[PDB]
């Protein structure tokens, strides 16, 4: 965010909140692994 913006604190608390409730892990596992190509004998 630009310096002295009104969005700084809200986005900070936003990233924290989204991190603690496990959303980031979900999106990470969504766009990296779950959609991956590579997954007998």
């Amino acid at each position: 965010t630009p310096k002295g913006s009104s969005l700084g604190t809200p986005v900070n608390l936003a990233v924290l909140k989204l991190s603690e409730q496990g959303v980031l892990d979900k999106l990470k596992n969504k766009w990296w692994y779950d959609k991956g190509e590579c997954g007998e004998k």
Binding site: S6, P10, L13
Partner: protein
């Protein structure tokens, strides 16, 4: 009482402006995460 109070004057606003200033105000309240509000107004302004 160690209260943190954000006092806003809603008194002077143009009727043409109307909803727009209110939108700005309540959005600014939402970014501050203020979930508690006291109106302090006559019935008309309260209705608005």
């Amino acid at each position: 009482k160690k209260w943190q109070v954000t006092a806003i004057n809603v008194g002077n606003i143009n009727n043409d402006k109307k909803d727009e200033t209110y939108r700005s105000l309540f959005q600014d309240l939402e970014l501050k995460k203020e979930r508690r509000v006291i109106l302090d107004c006559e019935r008309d302004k309260v209705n608005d």
